[PDB]
Design a protein around this ligand. Sequence first.
Ligand SMILES: O=c1ccn([C@@H]2O[C@H](COP(=O)(O)OP(=O)(O)O[C@H]3O[C@H](CO)[C@@H](O)[C@H](O)[C@H]3O)[C@@H](O)[C@H]2O)c(=O)[nH]1
Ligand SMILES: O=c1ccn([C@@H]2O[C@H](COP(=O)(O)OP(=O)(O)O[C@H]3O[C@H](CO)[C@@H](O)[C@H](O)[C@H]3O)[C@@H](O)[C@H]2O)c(=O)[nH]1
Ligand SMILES: O=c1ccn([C@@H]2O[C@H](COP(=O)(O)OP(=O)(O)O[C@H]3O[C@H](CO)[C@@H](O)[C@H](O)[C@H]3O)[C@@H](O)[C@H]2O)c(=O)[nH]1
Ligand SMILES: O=c1ccn([C@@H]2O[C@H](COP(=O)(O)OP(=O)(O)O[C@H]3O[C@H](CO)[C@@H](O)[C@H](O)[C@H]3O)[C@@H](O)[C@H]2O)c(=O)[nH]1
Lengths: 289, 289, 289, 289
Amino acid sequence: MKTRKGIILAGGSGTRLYPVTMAVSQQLLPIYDKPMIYYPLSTLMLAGIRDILIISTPQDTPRFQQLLGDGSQWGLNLQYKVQPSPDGLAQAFIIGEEFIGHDDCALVLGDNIFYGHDLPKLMEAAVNKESGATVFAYHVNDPERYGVVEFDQKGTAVSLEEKPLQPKSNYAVTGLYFYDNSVVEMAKNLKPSARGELEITDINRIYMEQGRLSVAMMGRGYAWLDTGTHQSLIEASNFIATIEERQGLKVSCPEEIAFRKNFINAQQVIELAGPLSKNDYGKYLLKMV
Amino acid sequence: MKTRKGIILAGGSGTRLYPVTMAVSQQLLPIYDKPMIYYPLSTLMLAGIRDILIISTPQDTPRFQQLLGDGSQWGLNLQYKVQPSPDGLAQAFIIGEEFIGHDDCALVLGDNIFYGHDLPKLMEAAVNKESGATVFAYHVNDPERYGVVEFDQKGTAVSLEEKPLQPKSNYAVTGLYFYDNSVVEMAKNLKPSARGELEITDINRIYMEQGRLSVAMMGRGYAWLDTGTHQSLIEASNFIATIEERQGLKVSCPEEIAFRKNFINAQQVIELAGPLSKNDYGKYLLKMV
Amino acid sequence: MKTRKGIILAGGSGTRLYPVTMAVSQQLLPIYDKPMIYYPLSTLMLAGIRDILIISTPQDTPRFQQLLGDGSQWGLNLQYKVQPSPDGLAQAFIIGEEFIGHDDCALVLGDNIFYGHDLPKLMEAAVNKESGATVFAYHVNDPERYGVVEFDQKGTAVSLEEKPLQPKSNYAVTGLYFYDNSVVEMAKNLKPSARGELEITDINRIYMEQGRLSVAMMGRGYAWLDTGTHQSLIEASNFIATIEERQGLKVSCPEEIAFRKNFINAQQVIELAGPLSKNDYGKYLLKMV
Amino acid sequence: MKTRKGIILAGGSGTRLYPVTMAVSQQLLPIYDKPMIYYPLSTLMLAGIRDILIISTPQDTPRFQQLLGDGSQWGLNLQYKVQPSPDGLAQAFIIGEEFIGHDDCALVLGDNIFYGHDLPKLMEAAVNKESGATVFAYHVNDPERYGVVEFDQKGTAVSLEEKPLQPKSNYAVTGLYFYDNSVVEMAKNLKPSARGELEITDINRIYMEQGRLSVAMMGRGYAWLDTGTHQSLIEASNFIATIEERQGLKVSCPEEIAFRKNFINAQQVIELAGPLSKNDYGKYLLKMV
Ligand SMILES: O=c1ccn([C@@H]2O[C@H](COP(=O)(O)OP(=O)(O)O[C@H]3O[C@H](CO)[C@@H](O)[C@H](O)[C@H]3O)[C@@H](O)[C@H]2O)c(=O)[nH]1
Ligand SMILES: O=c1ccn([C@@H]2O[C@H](COP(=O)(O)OP(=O)(O)O[C@H]3O[C@H](CO)[C@@H](O)[C@H](O)[C@H]3O)[C@@H](O)[C@H]2O)c(=O)[nH]1
Ligand SMILES: O=c1ccn([C@@H]2O[C@H](COP(=O)(O)OP(=O)(O)O[C@H]3O[C@H](CO)[C@@H](O)[C@H](O)[C@H]3O)[C@@H](O)[C@H]2O)c(=O)[nH]1
Ligand SMILES: O=c1ccn([C@@H]2O[C@H](COP(=O)(O)OP(=O)(O)O[C@H]3O[C@H](CO)[C@@H](O)[C@H](O)[C@H]3O)[C@@H](O)[C@H]2O)c(=O)[nH]1
């Protein structure tokens, strides 16, 4: 089956970004012209996923609801669930067990921003994979900060380690994952790691050992914009601004993607444009159709 | 009397910045490494004002309270009051009548960012003025968007117009004002303009006609950053970021300002820095003391 | 035949960028960590093109030769020729007539900077096209400034205009072109335009009217960094720096491309690294092998 | 005597910046909208110095002369001299001995960028000093990279060390110095240091030991931009671009300075702005007068 459910994990207290995140959720922070979460949301929409569960903190979930509603305005079906404590990426599947049901599901971090050509085809295999899991590898300068995947000479991925002190490679596993239905029980069966979290890397290693993990390489022609510091956030906004102003197009605009993939029509677009017409956003949509 | 009370007017629905202000008050949005509200707050602190009333919309006032508390952590006394409808800048003095009492009071807009090494000195005269008012002029190339002050050959302020279609000068009257106690009665007597607002420019014209208006000039050593569009927000964040890292200092950091003006001591700075120490905002403070 | 010759047109006086370009040729200006010309040179190398003619002004041509030499150090064959006066892009084929001989040839502008995922594949049809020409269309905000290609409902390119006052579309024809051997005679018979230049757009319209022009779409996932203003130059440098620092990889590094495509071996790279080892460039190459 | 002569030391091979300095003199590289040399040149002009000697390498000197000419277009008198080998900053006084004659003279490095609203007043004292020397200190986080000046409790300069492994303070002695006529003979008596150069710090230590040294402090309102690496160059260009755009001015624009200090008149400004009018550098000047 094609993966048609997705979860955006957008919780966390954001201590690493204080004081900016003392009174605004990290995933609501603007990346130039739109909140951060519009980017990973766009990534799921580009993969054809329209049924999505958003997980956030007790305090932030209602702000995401206020921003997005049930998503029907974009031809989506959005649901929300609260994560009491940030216990690890894998907890997303426990919290989302009912939402997932017996289907396949993708997980994307609310702060995962991708930009690049052919992202839909980069994700196509993952979306259509019969069983197992797919993750994406990206070369970074500081592998120690991420889940790291090692490849042998044939170029086959043969190991995964979470924040290794001596990375076996410079390839980090990104915040976009595709899983089959077995991930739910797999997650419920995990024990906390040394840092007290249900590790996504433990989930991935299981799939790998059973030969069910596909590691899709995301080439250097793609940008995976970091959002870990005040500096990286402003560099992400400038990057997106440089692209949009030059092209006269927006990057990860849900309304545009919904329209282009026919989740909604021109008429619906014109309505959505109304409340946004005081700036380039609403005008952009009207000009579009 | 030295002006020792101040009001930060930080209401508004933020429609102009949608969708980034759909779930977030514009004044909580970050300008590089701190919430926008830290900027006008620092401006008042730099004038020696420690008793401050923050006004916002019903919905947003509690978020400002959660972010700032009563201000005692920085040696300030912050109180809060709500503005049900944005009836105009001058309504700040009606809502703040009880807070003001019989004292002089300054008003700063919550979305105004003032920068300038000599600003404290420039505000000194305004703080000490015995009666009347002081406003701050800044050269812009789009005067038609603001209150505009015209000067005669001698250099005396001769007229004030709110968004003149044919500006008489290129000097905008910025959102920082120091008034004597009579502004409250002036405000309570104003009638709404054509746009249905109690205008700050009408208040300023009254002081001008009584011969009690001083105009402080902010020359090219100053910056008054635009926060009106997605584009101006990133331009403002870029400005703060480049100046802080190239000049090795922090712009409008209340903890630093409170410490430097002795509102708080080194022990308190370290205590405040703890929760903020995962990034340079907190580490800078620890190094400072 | 596969296109195996290329021309980099890097002349012009650069008046648009004065006074920066009174002091340095535009194509020698740094785009973060390397001279601008390294970018279009990398593009040709990525297409497998190693036999290249560099055209510049009488004053600058020796500068490029000083920088690049004959390119043998990177397994290329670089030659130089002077363009007495900037009489138009098409003059490149007259100046390069002897160099081109009877072969196919690509033309890239010395200030053309592309960044994106599958560039080699995007150019593959062009490199292998039997006869005719191939150009690349990119969506921009200001088509008026470029050669514009209009598409009909079916998506077929139906017209080409050079800087139309009323663009028939928002697709600009970039500075990368692939031609068969017939372009030389077209160029020799072209009459100057209203502005007194031999227009590349007239050459392209000739191919188009013969039904021999392919228009390869460069999606919004690619960046075509503008280099026309002081502002666009720093946005380009920041864009590249953002990508490189995050990845720990360089964009358009000729030594790396030469090495990866086996134009040179590791031993060769070590020698090239020597004179560059005082900064990350030299160190990067050493680390690479 | 008022200091009326200045020397800009602009040699060196700039190997740390390869490959961008392979075919371009480092001081001809742009810092946003004008060549690097314009900055230290403006620093001298702001001190009222109009008789200037530019010293560079045998390959680069002619390029500066090509760009700047005799400086008469800006009411200056510029002359040039070649430094055969980079034997040290202090060699400037030997090479420039004939130029200096019996007068006082300032020395500024060709790659130092000084910014600050009060710099002119700050330099006024130095220009008027009857005898002795004035140097400029600036706080840095990496004092070990520069000449370092230590102050006692009183605030008196008590030691000077060139690149100390154990810095005695964090105040760097920047690349701007004002000397009386005794500096020439001091230079003739210097012996090369361990690194084989005539050190400016030995000269300054002599003045210090004779109790004839003044140290001007550049505090928070100043910026002293690093131009040593590819990264610092873009950081410096970002600083200039942001300050210029946000504050509506030009940093170190010789035409503007020449006009404002009455070195040239409005007609000459327009004439000079013509060739520069395709962009804002020229348009700003036209608007200025
Ligand atoms: O104790 C925790 C841990 C994470 N989070 C949140 O979950 C998201 C994950 O971010 P982060 O903690 O910085 O990622 P890491 O936990 O360091 O790494 C995970 O996410 C990386 C990027 O997606 C993967 O490379 C790693 O393999 C995976 O373990 C964020 O928005 C966090 O706020 C919390 O709230 N609390
Ligand atoms: O009743 C009100 C009116 C305004 N605001 C806020 O105040 C700021 C002011 O913005 P805006 O209303 O759009 O500015 P204008 O009212 O058009 O202009 C005012 O602010 C300018 C400087 O920013 C001055 O030059 C003008 O003279 C003055 O009238 C915003 O964040 C508003 O939301 C409130 O909170 N309540
Ligand atoms: O005789 C010439 C003409 C141009 N150039 C250089 O080529 C580049 C092109 O810039 P410019 O001359 O300003 O562009 P245009 O010639 O106005 O336009 C051309 O380049 C555009 C994309 O850059 C295309 O869209 C247009 O169709 C094509 O005609 C610059 O670095 C020029 O200096 C030369 O070296 N020699
Ligand atoms: O004989 C020489 C020596 C240097 N330079 C140039 O002068 C600048 C100085 O650069 P560099 O030699 O690398 O700096 P240092 O000599 O290490 O440091 C000097 O410059 C610093 C400020 O930039 C001061 O703090 C130090 O005290 C002073 O010794 C460069 O553009 C050089 O190419 C010359 O043109 N000729």
